[PDB]
Amino acid sequence: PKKVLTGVVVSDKMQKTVTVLVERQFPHPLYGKVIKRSKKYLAHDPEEKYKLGDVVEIIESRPISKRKRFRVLRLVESGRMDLVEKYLIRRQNYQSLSK
Amino acid sequence: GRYIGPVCRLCRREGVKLYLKGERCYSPKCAMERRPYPPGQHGQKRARRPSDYAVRLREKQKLRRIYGISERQFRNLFEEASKKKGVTGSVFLGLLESRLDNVVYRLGFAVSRRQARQLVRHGHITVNGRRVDLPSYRVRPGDEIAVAEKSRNLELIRQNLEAMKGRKVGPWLSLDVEGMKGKFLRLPDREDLALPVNEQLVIEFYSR
Amino acid sequence: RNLSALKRHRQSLKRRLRNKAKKSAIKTLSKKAIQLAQEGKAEEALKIMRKAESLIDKAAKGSTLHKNAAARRKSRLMRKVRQLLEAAGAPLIGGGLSA
Amino acid sequence: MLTDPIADMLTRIRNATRVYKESTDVPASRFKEEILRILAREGFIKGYERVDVDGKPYLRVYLKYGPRRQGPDPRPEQVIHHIRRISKPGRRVYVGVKEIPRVRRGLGIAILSTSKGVLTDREARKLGVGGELICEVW
Amino acid sequence: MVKIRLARFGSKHNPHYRIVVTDARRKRDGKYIEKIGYYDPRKTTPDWLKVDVERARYWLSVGAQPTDTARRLLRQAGVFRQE
Amino acid sequence: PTINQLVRKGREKVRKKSKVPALKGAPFRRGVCTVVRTVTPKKPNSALRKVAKVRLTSGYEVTAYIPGEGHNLQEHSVVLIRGGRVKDLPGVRYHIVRGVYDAAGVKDRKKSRSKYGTKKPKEA
RNA sequence: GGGAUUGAAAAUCCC
RNA sequence: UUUUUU
RNA sequence: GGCUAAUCCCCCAUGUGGACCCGCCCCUUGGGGUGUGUCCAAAGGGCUUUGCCCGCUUCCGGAUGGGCCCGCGUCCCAUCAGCUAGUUGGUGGGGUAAUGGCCCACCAAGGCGACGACGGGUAGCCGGUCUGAGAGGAUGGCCGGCCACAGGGGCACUGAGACACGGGCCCCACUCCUACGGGAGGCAGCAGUUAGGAAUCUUCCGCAAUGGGCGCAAGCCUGACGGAGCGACGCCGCUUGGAGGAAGAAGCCCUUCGGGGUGUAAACUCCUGAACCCGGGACGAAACCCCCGACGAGGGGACUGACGGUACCGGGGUAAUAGCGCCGGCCAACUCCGUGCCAGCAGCCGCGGUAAUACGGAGGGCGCGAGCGUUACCCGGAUUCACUGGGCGUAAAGGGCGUGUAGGCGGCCUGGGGCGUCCCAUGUGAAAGACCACGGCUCAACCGUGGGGGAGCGUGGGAUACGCUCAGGCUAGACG
Ligand SMILES: [Mg+2]
Ligand SMILES: [Mg+2]
Ligand SMILES: [Mg+2]
Ligand SMILES: [Mg+2]
Ligand SMILES: [Mg+2]
Ligand SMILES: [Mg+2]
Ligand SMILES: [Mg+2]
Ligand SMILES: [Mg+2]
Ligand SMILES: [Mg+2]
Ligand SMILES: [Mg+2]
Ligand SMILES: [Mg+2]
Ligand SMILES: [Mg+2]
Ligand SMILES: [Mg+2]
Ligand SMILES: [Mg+2]
Ligand SMILES: [Mg+2]
Ligand SMILES: [Mg+2]
Ligand SMILES: [Mg+2]
Ligand SMILES: [Mg+2]
Ligand SMILES: [Mg+2]
Ligand SMILES: [Mg+2]
Ligand SMILES: [Mg+2]
Ligand SMILES: [Mg+2]
Ligand SMILES: [Mg+2]
Ligand SMILES: [Mg+2]
Ligand SMILES: [Mg+2]
Ligand SMILES: [Mg+2]
Ligand SMILES: [Mg+2]
Ligand SMILES: [Mg+2]
Ligand SMILES: [Mg+2]
Ligand SMILES: [Mg+2]
Ligand SMILES: [Mg+2]
Ligand SMILES: [Mg+2]
Ligand SMILES: [Mg+2]
Ligand SMILES: [Mg+2]
Ligand SMILES: [Mg+2]
Ligand SMILES: [Mg+2]
Ligand SMILES: [Mg+2]
Ligand SMILES: [Mg+2]
Ligand SMILES: [Mg+2]
Ligand SMILES: [Mg+2]
Ligand SMILES: [Mg+2]
Ligand SMILES: [Mg+2]
Ligand SMILES: [Mg+2]
Ligand SMILES: [Mg+2]
Ligand SMILES: [Mg+2]
Ligand SMILES: [Mg+2]
Ligand SMILES: [Mg+2]
Ligand SMILES: [Mg+2]
Ligand SMILES: [Mg+2]
Ligand SMILES: [Mg+2]
Ligand SMILES: [Mg+2]
Ligand SMILES: [Mg+2]
Ligand SMILES: [Mg+2]
Ligand SMILES: [Mg+2]
Ligand SMILES: [Mg+2]
Ligand SMILES: [Mg+2]
Ligand SMILES: [Mg+2]
Ligand SMILES: [Mg+2]
Ligand SMILES: [Mg+2]
Ligand SMILES: [Mg+2]
Ligand SMILES: [Mg+2]
Ligand SMILES: [Mg+2]
Ligand SMILES: [Mg+2]
Ligand SMILES: [Mg+2]
Ligand SMILES: [Mg+2]
Ligand SMILES: [Mg+2]
Ligand SMILES: [Mg+2]
Ligand SMILES: [Mg+2]
Ligand SMILES: [Mg+2]
Ligand SMILES: [Mg+2]
Ligand SMILES: [Mg+2]
Ligand SMILES: [Mg+2]
Ligand SMILES: [Mg+2]
Ligand SMILES: [Mg+2]
Ligand SMILES: [Mg+2]
Ligand SMILES: [Mg+2]
Ligand SMILES: [Mg+2]
Ligand SMILES: [Mg+2]
Ligand SMILES: [Mg+2]
Ligand SMILES: [Mg+2]
Ligand SMILES: [Mg+2]
Ligand SMILES: [Mg+2]
Ligand SMILES: [Mg+2]
Ligand SMILES: [Mg+2]
Ligand SMILES: [Mg+2]
Ligand SMILES: [Mg+2]
Ligand SMILES: [Mg+2]
Ligand SMILES: [Mg+2]
Ligand SMILES: [Mg+2]
Ligand SMILES: [Mg+2]
Ligand SMILES: [Mg+2]
Ligand SMILES: [Mg+2]
Ligand SMILES: [Mg+2]
Ligand SMILES: [Mg+2]
Ligand SMILES: [Mg+2]
Ligand SMILES: [Mg+2]
Ligand SMILES: [Mg+2]
Ligand SMILES: [Mg+2]
Ligand SMILES: [Mg+2]
Ligand SMILES: [Mg+2]
Ligand SMILES: [Mg+2]
Ligand SMILES: [Mg+2]
Ligand SMILES: [Mg+2]
Ligand SMILES: [Mg+2]
Ligand SMILES: [Mg+2]
Ligand SMILES: [Mg+2]
Ligand SMILES: [Mg+2]
Ligand SMILES: [Mg+2]
Ligand SMILES: [Mg+2]
Ligand SMILES: [Mg+2]
Ligand SMILES: [Mg+2]
Ligand SMILES: [Mg+2]
Ligand SMILES: [Mg+2]
Ligand SMILES: [Mg+2]
Ligand SMILES: [Mg+2]
Ligand SMILES: [Mg+2]
Ligand SMILES: [Mg+2]
Ligand SMILES: [Mg+2]
Ligand SMILES: [Mg+2]
Ligand SMILES: [Mg+2]
Ligand SMILES: [Mg+2]
Ligand SMILES: [Mg+2]
Ligand SMILES: [Mg+2]
Ligand SMILES: [Mg+2]
Ligand SMILES: [Mg+2]
Ligand SMILES: [Mg+2]
Ligand SMILES: [Mg+2]
Ligand SMILES: [Mg+2]
Ligand SMILES: [Mg+2]
Ligand SMILES: [Mg+2]
Ligand SMILES: [Mg+2]
Ligand SMILES: [Zn+2]
């Protein structure tokens, strides 16, 4: 089975490429509670179909570039920017906590 | 090499008759006769109430010294029994009673444990027709423990089997006295043994 | 001292010269053929491209190009010629390529 | 807002038994009602019944206790000696069917919520399913 | 070339072999593809040779190559007997 | 600490510091003596305890206790260091092995001869 | 370095 | 002043 | 500079077939078929020389080994907080077996980070191992698997495979030869030397076994391997005797001076017989090969030991090494003399300044015993980093207070989905180890055969209470 993931597009800004953010849930190995990690995958979008906020399935593929080993399978759900703004706000908080 | 030295001195320190001497632990000379107090300069002094450890220690020695075994083989035997299914207590005993050297004694081929040890070590003992010169060898149930016909004319063997005419044998043993054969029928039970030892004290010695 | 696996190094250098030279001719004819395609001369480019192909598949017979390495060059060659021949096309010889 | 309604209910019962209340109200929820059913079946409470209190539904829980005891401190033995929430919010506890515990060497229960419903441990092992471990009761 | 050969699993002066399928390039005692029997040269037990013929016959179909010894044993369990 | 807190920060394994910087954590280390002294001990006791400064093959210079009733240790003798402190002298963390290269064993020692490094005598 | 001194020492005192 | 609270 | 052979190199041919451009068909990333066009094959040798054996060529498939890619897991420091220019993506190209910024040209301006980027420190990883009731902690020697390296650094060539330990080139450090112009090296292979170090072996035998390379074979090579040697370094088995023997010798020790102790211990009586001598004397070894049969099946037959004259069997046969630690409490074992805060002991608490069971010796006793102690290190006791399993009024610990970002957490009812969670099946979880059973060395250690277990993840099927999510409703929280 080629691994299939489902995440949300957070970056339009490349050519023929979208950044998909894929959340994950699991119990902590020692302390047990359900914890929530999330990793960004660089997915291949040859037709520039998919846009910001689109929740898409992502599928393990033959390497397209560096950092690119997945293609966009299909659009599960379109246009939820709430997920994007959660990630935007977070990235924006990093401008404090320096000096 | 196991403990080699005075013995009817250990009869004394345990406060119980130890039959390692063979005969004369029966005759009124065992020194458990008219000297039941422990050896040394402070033997006749009033003993102090023993520590909870002191009790458990003297009880294992009571058992180990009876079978004439080094702590090494003794401890290995015990750790073996705590793994096998069944009561760690009794199983331990059945393993010491399965030692060939002890079996030879129990069968009355030799007077003492120590003498039975020398008879095995010197090849006078047959197991199922073959010679076995290892005292630690474990006897299985059903095996025939006989006297090698090379030594069947030896006066020490005819001596011990002379006194064995009509004497009864353990309910887990049986022997033919003329052909000098003998059989290990089954493992002995806790009840089968009259040993003056509380095993639960020995299990508790190794808990620490 | 003086192990006679030195003989292996001796032969190494002979094979070096054989392989080296075969490939030099491959490259020199391919560029010659592509040049003529770029210059519109259809017959001459084909007549040369055939020798390049023959030279390629011949180098695969030995241990020079043995693999699909031969097909790469053949594929890339025929592609470039037919495309470069898309400038007043008229593929005269038509020998190498397909109808 | 209430934080963990189940532990809240378990505690309402816990605190009420230590002063030997006859009854105690807990805010009404179906899931809570399914816990109360297992306890009522298992003999830890006389039982429960729905009831309104100022318009809003509640659940009266009718506790039970032992016989009055002999000299000093006549207060009876408890039927519920120990009630303890296990899988709380902020650390959730699920067990497979082989990971289901033996509570007080069989003399207690462990109320499991399973895909086949809220079951005691015995019922769940017999049904052959695991799930979220709600509490020990013994 | 995949081969059928013996690997030593006894102790010193107590050899015991595992008739074994492995690539000829691994160590004699190292990782192998399948165990297809055993061999006790000193014949200490009533059964000191076993094969599972039908499995040995498989590896010969796909081109395993037995040692002179492995073949001598496979012939004993009759891998090649054809009547 | 809430479970969440344990997920965020977690417990911290306690790092045990070594009481004996005999480097390479070796069982012994040999050195050459610098001084041989006699030092007054801590409060509840009084004596003249024999010690020695030692340059070690570890690159260290430390004091070491000379066990036994008498010693042949001089300013320049070479010795082997054991480890284990002398309670009642401060800053003395290592002992000296008696019966090693230049530190003779204790003469006329008849009871505990493994320690203090003396052989077995004959009885006529 | 020995006496006084203290349970014994420091100190102090005496050849 | 220092050890020892018997 | 010159001659020459070939299973060396090349050209033409035959095209089973394959390769490539294009078209079409089916599949769906570059998989399979098809048409036209183009391009591509080869090598001989041996005999029992009319037939067979060893090879050669193109293609399809199998088998084995491997390259590359992905999910998840993988130590410490935040007194490392911002990092990034081929850096992130794109188009075209180069390269390779093959994807890919792997490299290149041009275009866009991205990519990563508090879920720990970047930097620093440390370190091969795993099966397993030690420990622990477990959860965990620690560790990665030997054996097995993967990786990386071959004096340090870089690079390629040959080839199915290498960027190659005992192959090549270059730079650097070092040693050796040097006619000073220039050369040769590379034990982290086996042994062995030297240096460091508390410390780690034989410059051994053998190709008989197993395995590897080449050869039709005979055979050759193999410090892989199989054996021997040294070291109580570990484990296991074994001996230093057994039975009789005084209300009890001498000596030593204590003493109430009566006696008590070492102690059946010795002496001595009887018996056995570790060592050692003598004779016999292995398994590990049956194929390859030869003969019959067709060089098959099958049968038949012959040669082949390092260990080693070792194991083992039989005969003879001698009473024949004991040590080390401790005895104030924890902790089993106590008295005398010596010494007087000295000499010394001490793991901690503490002993010793004139009666010390704590120092030193003796007698005695306790504990182990070919060992026994010590030091170092690891886990344990330690619920003393507390998931199991701790805490913060006065013992270590509530931030001086608010506002609020991220995050964690979320009242009652219905429905959808089924992500978490649960069940079934199935694949995987190498071997060894661990566990149970039986068996082989006289036992054991050791070894063999069989059996069972297993968290995790893949896949298919299912359940929906709870948590998640989407849709709807309520008013007990909150707000107005
Ligand atoms: Mg999502
Ligand atoms: Mg875009
Ligand atoms: Mg994690
Ligand atoms: Mg963990
Ligand atoms: Mg856990
Ligand atoms: Mg697609
Ligand atoms: Mg789909
Ligand atoms: Mg997010
Ligand atoms: Mg047991
Ligand atoms: Mg049981
Ligand atoms: Mg009897
Ligand atoms: Mg019986
Ligand atoms: Mg234990
Ligand atoms: Mg050379
Ligand atoms: Mg050659
Ligand atoms: Mg040119
Ligand atoms: Mg041509
Ligand atoms: Mg090549
Ligand atoms: Mg819990
Ligand atoms: Mg599970
Ligand atoms: Mg349980
Ligand atoms: Mg549990
Ligand atoms: Mg069932
Ligand atoms: Mg390999
Ligand atoms: Mg098999
Ligand atoms: Mg057979
Ligand atoms: Mg068979
Ligand atoms: Mg061979
Ligand atoms: Mg066949
Ligand atoms: Mg037939
Ligand atoms: Mg973590
Ligand atoms: Mg977190
Ligand atoms: Mg931490
Ligand atoms: Mg260090
Ligand atoms: Mg230094
Ligand atoms: Mg240094
Ligand atoms: Mg110490
Ligand atoms: Mg004053
Ligand atoms: Mg006091
Ligand atoms: Mg010439
Ligand atoms: Mg020439
Ligand atoms: Mg041709
Ligand atoms: Mg054709
Ligand atoms: Mg086209
Ligand atoms: Mg054609
Ligand atoms: Mg050729
Ligand atoms: Mg011919
Ligand atoms: Mg001919
Ligand atoms: Mg000819
Ligand atoms: Mg394959
Ligand atoms: Mg493969
Ligand atoms: Mg560190
Ligand atoms: Mg970066
Ligand atoms: Mg940089
Ligand atoms: Mg750069
Ligand atoms: Mg490209
Ligand atoms: Mg290549
Ligand atoms: Mg490509
Ligand atoms: Mg462009
Ligand atoms: Mg992350
Ligand atoms: Mg994030
Ligand atoms: Mg680094
Ligand atoms: Mg390192
Ligand atoms: Mg264990
Ligand atoms: Mg760990
Ligand atoms: Mg480690
Ligand atoms: Mg680890
Ligand atoms: Mg590790
Ligand atoms: Mg080694
Ligand atoms: Mg191992
Ligand atoms: Mg080995
Ligand atoms: Mg390894
Ligand atoms: Mg791998
Ligand atoms: Mg390197
Ligand atoms: Mg290098
Ligand atoms: Mg080749
Ligand atoms: Mg390499
Ligand atoms: Mg390399
Ligand atoms: Mg070398
Ligand atoms: Mg060389
Ligand atoms: Mg050279
Ligand atoms: Mg140094
Ligand atoms: Mg040195
Ligand atoms: Mg060796
Ligand atoms: Mg061959
Ligand atoms: Mg021939
Ligand atoms: Mg040679
Ligand atoms: Mg070897
Ligand atoms: Mg031993
Ligand atoms: Mg005697
Ligand atoms: Mg005899
Ligand atoms: Mg043989
Ligand atoms: Mg034979
Ligand atoms: Mg041969
Ligand atoms: Mg013939
Ligand atoms: Mg045959
Ligand atoms: Mg004999
Ligand atoms: Mg004697
Ligand atoms: Mg005591
Ligand atoms: Mg001492
Ligand atoms: Mg005196
Ligand atoms: Mg005195
Ligand atoms: Mg006193
Ligand atoms: Mg004393
Ligand atoms: Mg003393
Ligand atoms: Mg003594
Ligand atoms: Mg030791
Ligand atoms: Mg510790
Ligand atoms: Mg702990
Ligand atoms: Mg601490
Ligand atoms: Mg806790
Ligand atoms: Mg519990
Ligand atoms: Mg605490
Ligand atoms: Mg609090
Ligand atoms: Mg205070
Ligand atoms: Mg405050
Ligand atoms: Mg607030
Ligand atoms: Mg919020
Ligand atoms: Mg909720
Ligand atoms: Mg939520
Ligand atoms: Mg639903
Ligand atoms: Mg639907
Ligand atoms: Mg599901
Ligand atoms: Mg499974
Ligand atoms: Mg396994
Ligand atoms: Mg374990
Ligand atoms: Mg057996
Ligand atoms: Mg299973
Ligand atoms: Mg599934
Ligand atoms: Mg309203
Ligand atoms: Mg209001
Ligand atoms: Zn007696």
CA distance F107 to F124: 19
H or E element in which residue B116 lies: helix B113-121
Task: Tell me if A12 sits within 8 A of A52, measured CB to CB.
Answer: yes
CA distance B85 to F20: 47
Contacts of A34 in chain D (CB under 8 A): 92
D91/D69 same-domain check: no
Positions of chain I reached by protein Cβ under 7 A: 9-12, 18-22, 29, 35-42, 58, 62-65, 68-73, 77, 81-82, 88-91, 93-102, 107-115, 136-138, 143-146, 157-161, 164, 166-168, 185, 196-199, 209-213, 224-228, 236-248, 253-254, 260-265, 271-274, 283-288, 296-298, 313-315, 319, 321-326, 330-335, 341-353, 360-370, 372-379, 385-387, 390-392, 405-414, 419-424, 430, 435-437, 439-444, 446-450, 458-459, 462-467, 476-477
Task: Tell me if B31 sits within 8 A of B8, measured CB to CB.
Answer: yes
Q: Which residue, chain included where needed, has tokens 């002992």?
A: F95
List, in order, residues 6 or more apart from E15 with CB less than 8 Å away.
E8, E41, E42
CB atoms within 10 A of CB A65: 10
CA distance A17 to A50: 9
Separation of E24 CA and I158 C1' (Å): 25
Antiparallel, parallel or unpaired: β B145-147 and B173-174: unpaired
CA distance C33 to C80: 10
Chains touching chain A at 3 or more Cβ pairs under 8 angstroms?
Answer: D, F
Residue D90, domain extent: 81-138
DSSP letter, residue E78:
T
CA distance B117 to B124: 10
Contacts of A32 in chain D (CB under 8 A): 91-93
Asked if strand I comes closer than 7 Å to A51 Cβ, the answer is no
D96 touches chain A (CB under 8 A): no
Closest CA to B108 of B179, B52, B169, B58: B169
Separation of A22 CA and I467 C1' (Å): 20
Query: Closest nucleotide to residue B114 (Cα to C1')?
Result: I242
Give protein residues whose Cβ lies within 7 A of nucleic acid chain H.
F 43-44
Residue B108's region, left for phi above 0, alpha for psi from -120 to 50, else beta, is: left
Alpha-carbon distances, residue D105 vs C33, D38, D101, D108 (angstroms) = 90, 19, 9, 7
**For domain C1-99, is the CATH number 1.20.58.110?**
yes
3-state helix, strand, coil in chain A (%, to 5): 15, 50, 35
**Which own/partner pairs from D72-80 qualify as long-range (CB within 8 Å, at least 24 positions apart)?**
D75/D20, D76/D20, D78/D17, D79/D17, D79/D43, D79/D44, D79/D45, D80/D13, D80/D14, D80/D17, D80/D44, D80/D45, D80/D137
Task: Tell me if D132 sits within 8 A of D113, measured CB to CB.
Answer: yes
CA distance F35 to F79: 12
CA distance A6 to chain D (A): 25
Separation of B208 CA and I325 C1' (Å): 21
Two tokens, residue B175:
């022997």
Q: Nearest 5°: phi and psi at D61?
A: -110, 125
Closest CA to D16 of D86, D63, D53, D60: D63
Two tokens, residue A94:
């990093």
Report the first-to-last Cα separation within chain A, whole angstroms. Answer: 47
CATH number of F1-124: 2.40.50.140
Chain D residue with minimum CA distance to F4 = D90
Q: A28–F4: do the CB atoms touch at under 8 Å?
A: no
List, in order, residues 6 or more apart from B43 with CB less than 8 Å away.
B12, B37
Asked if strand I comes closer than 7 Å to A38 Cβ, the answer is yes
Which ligand neighbours the alpha carbon of B2 most closely? 89
Q: Nearest 5°: phi and psi at A75?
A: -95, 115
CA distance B122 to B114: 13
Q: To what resolution in angstroms was this structure determined?
A: 3.4
Angle at B61 between CA B59 and CA B64, to 5 degrees: 115
| Distance from residue B185's CA to the centre of ligand 12 (Å) | 6
| Distance from residue A57's CA to the centre of ligand 7 (Å) | 9
Contacts of F7 in chain A (CB under 8 A): 28, 31, 33, 35
Angle at B89 between CA B83 and CA B93, to 5 degrees: 100
3 state DSSP class of C57: helix
Task: Tell me if B147 sits within 8 A of B170, measured CB to CB.
Answer: no
| Distance from residue B206's CA to the centre of ligand 106 (Å) | 29
Two tokens, residue F30:
């040999």
Closest CA to B154 of B105, B119, B201, B129: B119
Query: Closest nucleotide to residue F43 (Cα to C1')?
Result: H3
Q: Delimit the domains of chain B by residue range.
A: 1-96+194-208, 97-193
CA distance D37 to F43: 73
Q: A34–D92: do the CB atoms touch at under 8 Å?
A: yes
Residue F52 exposed, middle or buried by CB count within 10 Å (0-12, 13-18, 19+): buried
Q: Which residue, chain included where needed, has tokens 């165990």?
A: E35
Ion ligand 37 neighbours (CB, 5 A) are F 84
| Distance from residue E69's CA to the centre of ligand 28 (Å) | 8
Residue C87 exposed, middle or buried by CB count within 10 Å (0-12, 13-18, 19+): exposed
CA distance C6 to B25: 88
D69/D108 same-domain check: no
F-proximal residues of D, 85-124, CB under 8 Å:
90-91
Asked if strand I comes closer than 7 Å to A27 Cβ, the answer is yes
B8 labelled binding-site residue: yes
- For residues B126, B127, B133 and B137, what is the CA-based torsion angle, rounded to 10 degrees? -150
CA distance B173 to B184: 5
D-proximal residues of F, 1-30, CB under 8 Å:
2-4
Closest CA to B186 of B108, B85, B98: B98
Q: What is the total count of domains within chain D? A: 2
| Distance from residue E49's CA to the centre of ligand 88 (Å) | 26
Separation of C82 CA and I372 C1' (Å): 93
Quote the longest CA-to-CA distance of chain A.
47
Contacts of D90 in chain A (CB under 8 A): 33
D91 touches chain A (CB under 8 A): yes
- For residues A16, A19, A22 and A23, what is the CA-based torsion angle, rounded to 10 degrees? -160
CA distance D56 to F101: 93
H or E element in which residue C23 lies: helix C6-38
Report the first-to-last Cα separation within chain C, whole angstroms. Answer: 64
CA distance D86 to chain F (A): 14
Query: Closest nucleotide to residue A60 (Cα to C1')?
Result: I70
Q: Delimit the domains of chain C by residue range.
A: 1-99
Contacts of D91 in chain A (CB under 8 A): 31-33
Concatenated DSSP letters of B129-198:
TEE---TTPBPPTT-BEEE-TTTTT-HHHHHHHHTTTT----TTEE--TTTT--EE-SPPPTTT---S--
Chain D residue with minimum CA distance to A31 = D91
E strand residue ranges, chain D: 23-27, 45-53, 56-63, 83-85, 94-95, 109-114, 117-119, 131-137
CA distance E56 to E36: 7
Contacts of F3 in chain D (CB under 8 A): 90-91
Helix axis angle, C42-61 to C6-38, nearest 10°: 160
Contacts of F2 in chain D (CB under 8 A): 90
Asked if strand I comes closer than 7 Å to E78 Cβ, the answer is yes
Q: Which residue, chain included where needed, has tokens 């097909």?
A: C71
Count the residues in chain E: 83
Which amino acid appears at position B171 of this protein? Answer: P
CA distance D91 to chain F (A): 7
Closest CA to B119 of E27, B106, B128, A75: B106
Q: Which residue, chain included where needed, has tokens 């066990």?
A: F67
Per residue, the 3-state secondary structure of B158-169, as one string, reads HHHHHCCCCCCC
Query: Closest nucleotide to residue F44 (Cα to C1')?
Result: H3
Closest CA to A9 of A67, A63, A87, A66: A87
Two tokens, residue B78:
């015990």
Q: A34–D93: do the CB atoms touch at under 8 Å?
A: no
Task: Tell me if F68 sits within 8 A of F106, measured CB to CB.
Answer: yes
Cα four-point dihedral sign C33, C35, C38, C41: negative
CATH number at residue D123: 3.30.1490.10
CA distance A37 to chain F (A): 12
Task: Tell me if A54 sits within 8 A of A72, measured CB to CB.
Answer: no
List, in order, residues 6 or more apart from D1 with CB less than 8 Å away.
none
